[PDB]
Design an enzyme around this catalytic site. Structure first.
Site, PDB file in Angstrom:
ATOM      1  N   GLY A  10       0.818  -1.236   0.000  1.00 56.24           N
ATOM      2  CA  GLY A  10       0.000   0.000   0.000  1.00 56.24           C
ATOM      3  C   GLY A  10       0.834   1.260   0.000  1.00 56.24           C
ATOM      4  N   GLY A 144      -7.087   0.787   2.416  1.00 61.52           N
ATOM      5  CA  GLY A 144      -7.797  -0.417   2.012  1.00 61.52           C
ATOM      6  C   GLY A 144      -6.829  -1.562   1.693  1.00 61.52           C
ATOM      7  N   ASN A 206       0.932   7.932  13.630  1.00 65.12           N
ATOM      8  CA  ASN A 206       1.229   9.133  12.881  1.00 65.12           C
ATOM      9  C   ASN A 206       1.073  10.358  13.763  1.00 65.12           C
ATOM     10  OD1 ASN A 206       2.171   8.259  10.431  1.00 65.12           O
ATOM     11  ND2 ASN A 206       0.236   8.459   9.339  1.00 65.12           N
ATOM     12  N   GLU A 254      14.877 -13.862  17.503  1.00 66.78           N
ATOM     13  CA  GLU A 254      15.305 -13.238  18.749  1.00 66.78           C
ATOM     14  C   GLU A 254      14.390 -12.072  19.232  1.00 66.78           C
ATOM     15  OE1 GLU A 254      19.751 -13.008  18.757  1.00 66.78           O
ATOM     16  OE2 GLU A 254      19.477 -11.792  20.615  1.00 66.78           O
TER      17      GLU A 254
HETATM   18  N1  LIG Z   1       3.444   7.713   7.978  1.00 68.08           N
HETATM   19  C1  LIG Z   1       2.853   7.606   6.783  1.00 68.08           C
HETATM   20  N2  LIG Z   1       1.527   7.404   6.769  1.00 68.08           N
HETATM   21  C2  LIG Z   1       0.920   7.273   5.576  1.00 68.08           C
HETATM   22  C3  LIG Z   1       1.675   7.388   4.352  1.00 68.08           C
HETATM   23  N3  LIG Z   1       0.802   7.259   3.356  1.00 68.08           N
HETATM   24  C4  LIG Z   1      -0.429   7.045   3.881  1.00 68.08           C
HETATM   25  N4  LIG Z   1      -0.332   7.076   5.198  1.00 68.08           N
HETATM   26  C5  LIG Z   1      -1.373   6.887   6.180  1.00 68.08           C
HETATM   27  O1  LIG Z   1      -1.919   5.607   5.927  1.00 68.08           O
HETATM   28  C6  LIG Z   1      -3.315   5.732   5.975  1.00 68.08           C
HETATM   29  C7  LIG Z   1      -3.738   5.675   4.510  1.00 68.08           C
HETATM   30  O2  LIG Z   1      -3.530   4.400   3.940  1.00 68.08           O
HETATM   31  P1  LIG Z   1      -2.700   4.183   2.619  1.00 68.08           P
HETATM   32  O3  LIG Z   1      -1.454   3.388   2.944  1.00 68.08           O
HETATM   33  O4  LIG Z   1      -2.617   5.436   1.805  1.00 68.08           O
HETATM   34  O5  LIG Z   1      -3.680   3.117   1.956  1.00 68.08           O
HETATM   35  P2  LIG Z   1      -3.407   2.111   0.736  1.00 68.08           P
HETATM   36  O6  LIG Z   1      -2.733   0.951   1.436  1.00 68.08           O
HETATM   37  O7  LIG Z   1      -2.687   2.773  -0.365  1.00 68.08           O
HETATM   38  O8  LIG Z   1      -4.909   1.583   0.399  1.00 68.08           O
HETATM   39  P3  LIG Z   1      -5.923   2.055  -0.778  1.00 68.08           P
HETATM   40  O9  LIG Z   1      -5.467   3.345  -1.382  1.00 68.08           O
HETATM   41  O10 LIG Z   1      -7.204   2.000   0.013  1.00 68.08           O
HETATM   42  O11 LIG Z   1      -5.884   0.993  -1.844  1.00 68.08           O
HETATM   43  C8  LIG Z   1      -3.576   7.080   6.628  1.00 68.08           C
HETATM   44  O12 LIG Z   1      -3.536   7.005   8.063  1.00 68.08           O
HETATM   45  C9  LIG Z   1      -2.434   7.933   6.107  1.00 68.08           C
HETATM   46  O13 LIG Z   1      -2.082   9.122   6.858  1.00 68.08           O
HETATM   47  C10 LIG Z   1       3.106   7.618   4.462  1.00 68.08           C
HETATM   48  O14 LIG Z   1       3.789   7.721   3.424  1.00 68.08           O
HETATM   49  N5  LIG Z   1       3.619   7.721   5.687  1.00 68.08           N
END
Ligand SMILES: Nc1nc2c(ncn2[C@@H]2O[C@H](COP(=O)(O)OP(=O)(O)OP(=O)(O)O)[C@@H](O)[C@H]2O)c(=O)[nH]1
Ligand SMILES: CC[C@H](C)[C@@H]([C@@H](CC(=O)N1CCC[C@H]1[C@H](OC)[C@@H](C)C(=O)N[C@H](C)[C@@H](O)c1ccccc1)OC)N(C)C(=O)[C@@H](NC(=O)[C@@H](NC)C(C)C)C(C)C
Ligand SMILES: Nc1ncnc2c1ncn2[C@@H]1O[C@H](COP(=O)(O)OP(=O)(O)CP(=O)(O)O)[C@@H](O)[C@H]1O
Ligand SMILES: Nc1nc2c(ncn2[C@@H]2O[C@H](COP(=O)(O)OP(=O)(O)O)[C@@H](O)[C@H]2O)c(=O)[nH]1
Ligand SMILES: [Ca+2]
Ligand SMILES: [Ca+2]
Ligand SMILES: [Mg+2]
Ligand SMILES: [Mg+2]
Lengths: 439, 427, 346, 54
Positions: A10, A144, A206, A254
């Protein structure tokens, strides 16, 4: 030497992976093309760094990584970014359309059409491993794909690689940067389905990281890049013992042994110090006592919670820089008399210490100043259950009215899977309370 | 490359629809030729959402133009941007619909609908991964109303797993004196409740009042009404057209905005309100925030203080401090928390796009799923019943094959909608 | 506008703080489960401290200190005093005390070690349990402990109390202490003697209208004879100490009280301070004291959610607002407390 | 107080300090999982198409 495969799932998983491999390469002095002048066994080796990189006859060090996203945008930035040559095309996998912030669309609907392909790509890397230990899996709880695809992936790696360790780096959702109001639903769903399949999971909230960035790097409004650079230093810290000579946490087994005595309670709190702005003109370098003491300040934790009001089951300290044992023991002596630190009765009160003399590396032009010594504490404290409580409460508020549930049912999941996942968490919040309180 | 198919139907639909294409084409640097002459690459990164590429690096709206008379379509063609549209995507009949939903849905419209679907299908088939459809239309006439809803039903047959989105223009006797409009609109709402995922309620009542009370236009024209519609439409589509985190596709918006499938009718809002006349002071971020949430800035004539917000999306355009935007956004919620359902935590989500609309250094677009939207449906319902209880004007409809029963089911379904909203305003 | 929620309906004191805040017209009350509050006045049991300080844009304050129960539960209090080196077994202001369980950890054995050096010094050997009973006879209490079911405390009963005359009466002192978010310890200048109305009888321990000085257990059995509600306030008791004993309240009793209060709360400061936390806490305590005939002060118990005395609600509740709350949330546009601080150098 | 397990190397060192002593679904069950979900999607889509045909 035994190999570790990193899987990034993701947007969040992928962007964090990028940040980690950027740092790993700098740490091991591996260049953007994958060439490593300091490696003298050309085309091979069983050095410690080879746990994370494979080698080619052309002299190329390639991550034991697979990135998977259900949409292509983010992985396309890797494919054409500064590290494009580091990776074999077959390690970068994408779909056409994403899971739309829905656990079920990512688990059931799209997960089905892609699971086999990824397993096959993971099999290609496993087959280059003389002694694979297992996997590090990076994903968000709230996306997702990150929630839904990951849990499916985790059920399958349990089936196809049963004897192998599985570790997570999981992004716990925060409104200051979250993209979806259903993240609580997704977080609980994936936690439930993933719990038996993960041996040890490092959660990053976050919220925590965002504030570290505001407060200690003077960043008015943190971006993912800011957040991820920080997260990647914590990760590197945690994984250093697998990529460097040492005698503490030398293998994935570990971490479970040192950090997780009760299997379901496998969520160690990370605390990291010092975080110092690169713009800061004059900075007094912080002593061993000072940065060790900072490991007990909630403000420096990857998750905000209060470890004074639960109990410990294990505690490791991981140091990089100019640090000697004697200074660590004096630091710890002082701290024990000042602070509230209660282990459970069936566990020694004590710390396992790891020191790597190489000080932390930083991304040039990053936000973090170079420092003389740093530390990351990994403590398994029942206080981290505060995060579970928070998530569960939000889930209860929404689910009581069935708000948004239809999106999930719409993808083939059954309303009952919600209440069953919530029951599992209910019991999880109970395990944590038994272990950590008395009267 | 996550592609949207746009359809515009009937007089209103094509009027606002053409306006939409004029405005976004300017925002993406496309001229009437279809040639890109802009100076930035944000403009192009996501252009394939709304345009197909053609030989000679040509950009062509993914747009189907539908009417049952030609008048408005001829006007589109010989207007400014008319050359940009793909000629064989103009699909029209001759007879017209006489403001009669039944002609549009059942008789005259059925004769023309298959031809429209042939064009839709051709446009779908060349999409790398089509996300769904957007439709512009009014609900008070015949073609946009009755035929447009007929199309929606048929598209969902062929593409049942794609998202359906409408900009639906709600009628008001402040703007039209045609007596049967409440009929056509109640009949249309029935359709939309069942077959769309997202509907922007664009209320001619609110547009007229904003034009008269706020913009001090004593004689509002459709040109003045539409300038508000096009600004709102640019605004609410910004997260789909430019690079971004939040609500970047139709499905994700739907997931964030729709807690319950039937409750997908959105109140849009825009700040700053302007007439077509230069705006010289840029707004401060606090002003945008206060204005965009002001009832006077809502494009649906509902008092938001009479209900509760289920979900909100806010979209801020221009060069500004994200820090100030977060502080203000947070400050609206914390100062008026009681208007935001407590059982959907963190229900307000905020996007910032660096490119402003033409004309403004700063703007904000508000999309609200609020329970106060019932006031709109009750109003239409009151107007309907006043005629329906004497079966008045019904012969225009029964003469095209319709039964009273069908009116009665529609009234019922819209009254159910209203009471479901009420349900959630009291939870 | 500041905002707040209310989660303990039966709180005499916080009822009054709700009123005073509203009446500023700068505080808005919300439904108890709306999380977008500056201030919570929380429930007494399982207050959800883990959900606090995670609302961006809101400084959040609560009227309880997590961990405080350790001072305020009799079993914990006793435990805390023996174990903490700053208090220690030495501790000369707390009655010898032991934690005793039913047999459905425990230090029942170590209790008797002292019971049979008072039966082997034949001196005063009266104890008291935690429904509560005094006795000279150990096993008439131990057989009372197991017959009730909870974990209990056995404490040395102070056989030589100061006695107010006229009346040959007994009393405790209640002092109201407020600890703010900075861990300033604020003693309210008005305390109250909760008195007995019936002469102290040292030869008979069942007739407990004279041994227990509780505002309820007096009423529900000469209530009102020498002063309203069996409540003597400080002007009068000071006056009496001058008249009868030639000393002051300040000197004979109140230095000791200030000392015990600081020692108690500085002991736990590290376990409960919110100074660097993501939400801040304050809390009102009620400390309860006994004085012996020698003018020696003894700590009885600490109350986590005290009630005030009627006369004093109006002033105390105002002080809470001024120092505990408006310190954190200022307004636009004489102090009833004394600040406990003391930095001796050694 | 008590240091132990001291291990030293060119890169660093490690040890332990002690202040105080004490006092799974089958491949099949999954493929099934996925397939029941998909069947339920098919039913739902079929019901709608039946409804649209009406
Ligand atoms: N720390 C951090 N959080 C992230 C990042 N990208 C997205 N998020 C967080 O992750 C959540 C969003 O999920 P994503 O990882 O964008 O989702 P995805 O896995 O791409 O899933 P879909 O787009 O639904 O197919 C939110 O809480 C965002 O703030 C990142 O690069 N760093
Ligand atoms: C509020 C009711 C509409 C909006 C106005 C408007 C119609 C309009 O704008 N018309 C009638 C087609 C042409 C258009 C305007 O001419 C005036 C042009 C310049 C324009 O705005 N053209 C725009 C740019 C063009 O894109 C366009 C848009 C829609 C349709 C055609 C053309 O004329 C003032 N109308 C009917 C009126 O104001 C009328 N008044 C009434 O109906 C009153 N009842 C008797 C109203 C207030 C309910 C007439 C007495 C004139
Ligand atoms: N060690 C002791 N010596 C003499 N008297 C004692 C005593 N312990 C308790 N008492 C008497 O018993 C009374 C009530 O006991 P205690 O305060 O422990 O119970 P409680 O919690 O129900 C009332 P509160 O919460 O207000 O203190 C005291 O006012 C005191 O007079
Ligand atoms: N806002 C706006 N409303 C319009 C416009 N044209 C027509 N309307 C409204 O739309 C309704 C009549 O519908 P129309 O689209 O003309 O009929 P159709 O051609 O049969 O679809 C009435 O409520 C009109 O006020 C327009 O250009 N702008
Ligand atoms: Ca090598
Ligand atoms: Ca015909
Ligand atoms: Mg994604
Ligand atoms: Mg017309």
């Amino acid at each position: 030497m035994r190999e570790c495969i990193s899987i990034h799932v993701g947007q969040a998983g992928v962007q964090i992976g990028n940040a980690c491999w950027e740092l790993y390469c700098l740490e091991h002095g591996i260049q953007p093309d994958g060439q490593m002048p300091s490696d003298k066994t050309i085309g091979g080796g069983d050095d410690s760094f080879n746990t994370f990189f494979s080698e080619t006859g052309a002299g190329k060090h390639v991550p034991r990584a697979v990135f998977v996203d259900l949409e292509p945008t983010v992985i396309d930035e890797v494919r054409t970014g500064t590290y494009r040559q580091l990776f074999h095309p077959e390690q970068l996998i994408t779909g056409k359309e994403d899971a739309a912030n829905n656990y079920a669309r990512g688990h059931y609907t799209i997960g089905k059409e892609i699971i086999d392909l990824v397993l096959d790509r993971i099999r290609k890397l496993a087959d280059q491993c003389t002694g694979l230990q297992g996997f590090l899996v990076f994903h968000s709880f709230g996306g997702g794909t990150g929630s839904g695809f990951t849990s499916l992936l985790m059920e399958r790696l349990s089936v196809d690689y049963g004897k192998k360790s599985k570790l997570e780096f999981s992004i716990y959702p925060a409104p200051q940067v979250s993209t979806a109001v259903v993240e609580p639903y997704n977080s609980i769903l994936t936690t439930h389905t993933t719990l038996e399949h993960s041996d040890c999971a490092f959660m990053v909230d976050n919220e925590a990281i965002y504030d570290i960035c505001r407060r200690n790097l003077d960043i008015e409004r943190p971006t993912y890049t800011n957040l991820n650079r920080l997260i990647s230093q914590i990760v590197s810290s945690i994984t250093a013992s697998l990529r460097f000579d040492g005698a503490l946490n030398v293998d994935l087994t570990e971490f479970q042994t040192n950090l997780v005595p009760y299997p379901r309670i496998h969520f160690p709190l990370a605390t990291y110090a010092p975080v110092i702005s690169a713009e800061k003109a004059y900075h007094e370098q912080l002593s061993v006592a000072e940065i060790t003491n900072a490991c007990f300040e909630p403000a420096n934790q990857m998750v905000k919670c209060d470890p004074r009001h639960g109990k410990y089951m294990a505690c490791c300290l991981l140091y990089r820089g100019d640090v000697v044992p004697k200074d660590v023991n004096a630091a710890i002596a002082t701290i024990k008399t000042k602070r509230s630190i209660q282990f459970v009765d069936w566990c020694p009160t004590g710390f396992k210490v790891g020191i790597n003399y190489q000080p932390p590396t930083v991304v040039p032009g990053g936000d973090l100043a170079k420092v003389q010594r740093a530390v990351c504490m990994l403590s398994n404290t029942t206080a981290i259950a505060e995060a579970w409580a928070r998530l569960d409460h939000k889930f209860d508020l929404m689910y009581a009215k069935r708000a948004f549930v239809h999106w999930y049912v719409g993808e083939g999941m059954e309303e009952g899977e919600f209440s069953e996942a919530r029951e599992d968490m209910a019991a999880l919040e109970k395990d944590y309370e038994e272990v950590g309180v008395d009267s | 490359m996550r592609e949207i198919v746009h359809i515009q139907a009937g007089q209103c639909g094509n009027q606002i629809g053409a306006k939409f294409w004029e405005v976004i084409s300017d925002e993406h640097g496309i001229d009437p030729t279809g040639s890109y002459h802009g100076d930035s690459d944000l403009q192009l990164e996501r252009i394939n959402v709304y345009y197909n590429e053609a030989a000679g690096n040509k950009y062509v709206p993914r747009a189907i133009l539908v009417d049952l008379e030609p008048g408005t379509m001829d006007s589109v063609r010989s207007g400014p941007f008319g050359q940009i549209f793909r000629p064989d995507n103009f699909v029209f009949g001759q007879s017209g619909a006489g403001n009669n939903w039944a002609k549009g849905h059942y008789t005259e419209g059925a004769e023309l609908v298959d031809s429209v679907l042939d064009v839709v299908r051709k446009e779908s088939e060349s999409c790398d991964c089509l996300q769904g459809f957007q439709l512009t239309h009014s609900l008070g006439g015949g073609t946009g109303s009755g035929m447009g809803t007929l199309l929606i039903s048929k598209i969902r047959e062929e593409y049942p797993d794609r998202i359906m989105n409408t900009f639906s223009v709600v009628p008001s006797p402040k703007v039209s004196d045609t007596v049967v409009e409440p009929y056509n609109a109640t009949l249309s709402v029935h359709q939309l409740v069942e077959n769309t995922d997202e509907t922007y309620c664009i209320d001619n009542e609110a547009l007229y009042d904003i034009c008269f009370r706020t913009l001090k236009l004593t004689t509002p024209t459709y040109g003045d009404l539409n300038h508000l519609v096009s600004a709102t439409m640019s605004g609410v589509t910004t997260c789909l057209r430019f690079p971004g985190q939040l609500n970047a596709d139709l499905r994700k918006l739907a997931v964030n905005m729709v807690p319950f499938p039937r409750l997908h009718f959105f109140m849009p809002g825009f700040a700053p309100l302007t007439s077509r006349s230069q705006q010289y002071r840029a707004l401060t971020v606090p002003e945008l925030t206060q204005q965009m949430f002001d009832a006077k800035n809502m494009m649906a004539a509902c008092d938001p203080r009479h209900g509760r917000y289920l979900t909100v999306a806010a979209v801020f355009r221009g060069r500004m401090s994200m820090k100030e935007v977060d502080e203000q956004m947070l400050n609206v919620q914390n100062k008026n928390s009681s208007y935001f359902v407590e059982w959907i935590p963190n229900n307000v989500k905020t996007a910032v796009c660096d490119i402003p609309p033409r004309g403004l250094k700063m703007s904000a677009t508000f999309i609200g799923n609020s329970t106060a939207i019932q006031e709109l449906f009750k109003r239409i319902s009151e107007q309907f019943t006043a005629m329906f209880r004497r079966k008045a004007f019904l012969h225009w409809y029964t003469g095209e094959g319709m039964d009273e029963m069908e009116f009665t089911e529609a009234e019922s379904n819209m009254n159910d909608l209203v009471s479901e909203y009420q349900q959630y305003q009291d939870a | 506008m500041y905002t707040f929620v209310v989660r303990d309906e039966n709180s005499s004191v916080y009822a009054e703080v709700s009123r005073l805040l509203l009446a500023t017209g700068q505080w808005k009350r919300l439904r108890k489960d709306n999380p977008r509050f500056n201030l919570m006045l929380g429930e007494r049991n399982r207050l959800p401290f883990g959900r606090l300080g995670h609302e961006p844009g809101l400084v959040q304050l609560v009227n309880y200190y997590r961990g405080a129960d350790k001072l305020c539960r009799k079993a914990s209090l006793v435990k805390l005093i023996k174990t903490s080196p700053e208090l220690s077994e030495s501790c000369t202001w707390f009655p010898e005390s032991y934690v005793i369980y039913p047999t459905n950890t425990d230090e029942r054995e170590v209790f008797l070690a002292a019971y049979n050096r008072r039966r082997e010094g034949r001196e005063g050997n009266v104890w008291i349990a935690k429904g509560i009973l005094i006795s000279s006879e150990a096993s008439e209490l131990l057989d009372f402990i197991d017959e009730q079911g909870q974990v209990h405390v056995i404490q040395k009963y102070l056989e030589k109390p100061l006695l107010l005359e006229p009346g040959h009466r007994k009393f405790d002192i209640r002092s109201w202490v407020l600890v703010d978010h900075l861990y300033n310890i604020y003693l309210y200048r008005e305390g109250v003697l909760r008195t007995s109305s019936e002469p102290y009888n040292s030869a008979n321990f069942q007739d407990k209208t004279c041994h227990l000085t509780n505002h309820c257990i007096q009423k529900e059995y000469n209530y009102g004879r020498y002063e309203e509600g069996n409540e003597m306030f400080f002007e009068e008791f000071n006056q009496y100490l001058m008249d009868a004993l030639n000393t002051t309240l300040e000197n004979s009793i109140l230095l000791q009280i200030k000392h015990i209060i600081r020692s108690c709360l500085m002991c736990i400061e590290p376990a409960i301070s919110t100074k660097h936390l993501h939400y801040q806490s304050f809390q009102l305590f009620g400390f309860d004291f006994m004085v012996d005939e020698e003018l020696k002060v003894w700590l009885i118990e600490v109350n986590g959610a005290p009630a005030c005395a009627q006369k004093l609600y109006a002033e105390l509740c105002q002080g809470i607002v001024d120092v505990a709350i408006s310190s954190v949330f200022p307004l636009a546009d004489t102090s009833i407390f004394i600040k406990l601080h003391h930095h001796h150098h050694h | 107080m008590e240091v132990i397990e001291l291990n030293k190397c060119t890169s660093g060192q490690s040890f332990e300090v002690i202040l105080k002593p004490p006092s799974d679904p089958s491949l099949e069950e999954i493929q099934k999982k996925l397939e029941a979900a998909e069947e339920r999607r098919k039913y739902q889509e079929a019901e709608l198409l039946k409804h649209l045909a009406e």
